[PDB]
Amino acid sequence: TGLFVTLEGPEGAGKSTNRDYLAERLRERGIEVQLTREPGGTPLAERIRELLLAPSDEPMAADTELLLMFAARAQHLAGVIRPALARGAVVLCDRFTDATYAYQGGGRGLPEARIAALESFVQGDLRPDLTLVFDLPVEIGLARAAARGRLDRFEQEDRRFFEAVRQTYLQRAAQAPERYQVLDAGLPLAEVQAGLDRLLPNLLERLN
Amino acid sequence: SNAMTGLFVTLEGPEGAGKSTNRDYLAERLRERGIEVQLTREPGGTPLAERIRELLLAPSDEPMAADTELLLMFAARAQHLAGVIRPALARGAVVLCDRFTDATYAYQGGGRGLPEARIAALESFVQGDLRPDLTLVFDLPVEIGLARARLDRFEQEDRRFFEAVRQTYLQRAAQAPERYQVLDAGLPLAEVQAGLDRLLPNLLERLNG
Numbered sequence: 001t002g003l004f005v006t007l008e009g010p011e012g013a014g015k016s017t018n019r020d021y022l023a024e025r026l027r028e029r030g031i032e033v034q035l036t037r038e039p040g041g042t043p044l045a046e047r048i049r050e051l052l053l054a055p056s057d058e059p060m061a062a063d064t065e066l067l068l069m070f071a072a073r074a075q076h077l078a079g080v081i082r083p084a085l086a087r088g089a090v091v092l093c094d095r096f097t098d099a100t101y102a103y104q105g106g107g108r109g110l111p112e113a114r115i116a117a118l119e120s121f122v123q124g125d126l127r128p129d130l131t132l133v134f135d136l137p138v139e140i141g142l143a144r145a146a147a148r149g150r151l152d153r154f155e156q157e158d159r160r161f162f163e164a165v166r167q168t169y170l171q172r173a174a175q176a177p178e179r180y181q182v183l184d185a186g187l188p189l190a191e192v193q194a195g196l197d198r199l200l201p202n203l204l205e206r207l208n
Numbered sequence: 209s210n211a212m213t214g215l216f217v218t219l220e221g222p223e224g225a226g227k228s229t230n231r232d233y234l235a236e237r238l239r240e241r242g243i244e245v246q247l248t249r250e251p252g253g254t255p256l257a258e259r260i261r262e263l264l265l266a267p268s269d270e271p272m273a274a275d276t277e278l279l280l281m282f283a284a285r286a287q288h289l290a291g292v293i294r295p296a297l298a299r300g301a302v303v304l305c306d307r308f309t310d311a312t313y314a315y316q317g318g319g320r321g322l323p324e325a326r327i328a329a330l331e332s333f334v335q336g337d338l339r340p341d342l343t344l345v346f347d348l349p350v351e352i353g354l355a356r357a358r359l360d361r362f363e364q365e366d367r368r369f370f371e372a373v374r375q376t377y378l379q380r381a382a383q384a385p386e387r388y389q390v391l392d393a394g395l396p397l398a399e400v401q402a403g404l405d406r407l408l409p410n411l412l413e414r415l416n417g
């Protein structure tokens with residue numbers, strides 16, 4: 001009886017920031033909210049995250065990257081997301097399978113059909129009830145993120161990779177607007193959050 | 209490098225059957241004949257695949273979902289295939305691989321109860337049409353193997369789990385006998401190894417063919 005909401009977008013778009021904003025808006029209204037993120041969300045899934053992000057002189061096969069992302073997702077679904085939904089909680093999840101389509105499909109060039117096969121394999125028919133896409137020019141997000149220290153495997157990638165990621169998110173949202181809301185994350189944060197405030201009534205609608 | 213066909217041999221069987229011992233025995237016999245061998249094992253075989261092995265085998269208070277276990281096994285396999293197995297086959301090596309996808313059917317299918325069709329789907333997903341040229345099944349009563357063998361996640365399972373493992377290997381071998389050889393791993397090691405000596409000419413025939 002819960003509601004599954006995911007947050008998506010390029011690096012530095014404001015996913016993590018706005019996850020916490022939405023959580024407070026919901027919690028102050030007396031709603032139980034479970035916050036989580038991918039890859040990760042459980043101790044084992046966090047170990048898989050570490051493998052996915054750590055640079056190595058050994059190149060990771062694209063299939064390995066895809067399978068690890070879905071292995072972490074399977075564990076996270078079983079351990080956190082499904083139990084929260086069964087409790088009737090709102091789950092706010094920072095990244096989910098749209099990120100796999102964007103990064104592994106758009107970025108890595110893996111066929112959409114292969115990603116879809118694993119989506120069905122891991123999730124069955126489970127999909128987010130609502131996905132918020134925080135869209136902006138990738139360089140603006142990269143500048144906000146201001147990566148410091150050793151870059152992780154995805155931070156190592158070039159602009160073409162991240163542009164493909166961005167465009168894949170937009171393409172997927174355009175094909176199923178009933179499930180997606182695209183926010184202009186290039187707006188000042190106060191304006192992005194006003195946009196979120198305006199979606200609140202509907203979110204509650206889907207929820208109840 | 210050299211561009212000739214190699215041979216993909218896998219070794220399978222219940223816990224303590226003698227897979228690892230006999231992989232090394234075969235390696236020594238082939239190297240005595242001056243044949244290039246690539247030794248490897250699963251899950252593992254590359255730095256990343258070995259980190260995945262660590263997650264698969266280490267006990268934890270957090271239950272690992274069966275789907276997670278299956279996907280991790282195949283993620284390690286994808287990396288291993290790309291990094292070690294395919295290149296070895298392309299340069300004409302005999303790959304001697306301690307466990308491969310038959311173990312997935314046996315442990316994740318027989319043991320865990322995951323549907324065979326789901327494992328088959330991932331097999332095709334990860335391997336395309338690639339299968340071992342020869343799979344050696346070291347078969348014996350599970351209690352004998354266990355009495356040979358701190359325990360990892362799989363070693364902690366019960367006897368019915370291990371019987372399912374054993375029987376799954378035998379079933380798969382019976383269905384595709386052109387690809388499998390079942391050895392009686394309950395014999396003394398020297399007799400198991402005499403059996404391996406006896407099959408070496410056929411192994412070499414597959415390598416040359």
Ligand SMILES: Nc1ncnc2c1ncn2[C@@H]1O[C@H](COP(=O)(O)OP(=O)(O)O)[C@@H](O)[C@H]1O
Nearest residue numbers: 011012013014015016017144185187188189192
């Ligand atoms: N609309 C915005 N305008 C200006 N700065 C923002 C905006 N959204 C987020 N930021 C800032 O950008 C940085 C990255 O935000 P973050 O939520 O970590 O992004 P993500 O999780 O999408 O990578 C943070 O310092 C955050 O305060």
Ligand SMILES: Nc1ncnc2c1ncn2[C@@H]1O[C@H](COP(=O)(O)OP(=O)(O)O)[C@@H](O)[C@H]1O
Nearest residue numbers: 223224225226227228229356393395396397400
């Ligand atoms: N046929 C055999 N008879 C007696 N002992 C054996 C035999 N095969 C292996 N062993 C011993 O049993 C133990 C497990 O062998 P190992 O090769 O590690 O098995 P596996 O890799 O199949 O678990 C080792 O101590 C090994 O020397």
Ligand SMILES: Cc1cn([C@H]2C[C@H](O)[C@@H](COP(=O)(O)O)O2)c(=O)[nH]c1=O
Nearest residue numbers: 038039069095096097099100103104154
């Ligand atoms: C969830 C998910 C994340 N990723 C990447 C996006 C990010 O670069 C990284 C996670 O970083 P993040 O926690 O800051 O969002 O993992 C994928 O490539 N595929 C996926 O399915």
Ligand SMILES: Cc1cn([C@H]2C[C@H](O)[C@@H](COP(=O)(O)O)O2)c(=O)[nH]c1=O
Nearest residue numbers: 250251281307308311312315316362363
């Ligand atoms: C290769 C593989 C191994 N396993 C298990 C069998 C063993 O208990 C364990 C590997 O340990 P081992 O080195 O002794 O063979 O992994 C699976 O469950 N599925 C697989 O696909």
Ligand SMILES: [Mg+2]
Nearest residue numbers: 015016017094
């Ligand atoms: Mg973030």
Ligand SMILES: [Mg+2]
Nearest residue numbers: 227228229306
């Ligand atoms: Mg062994």
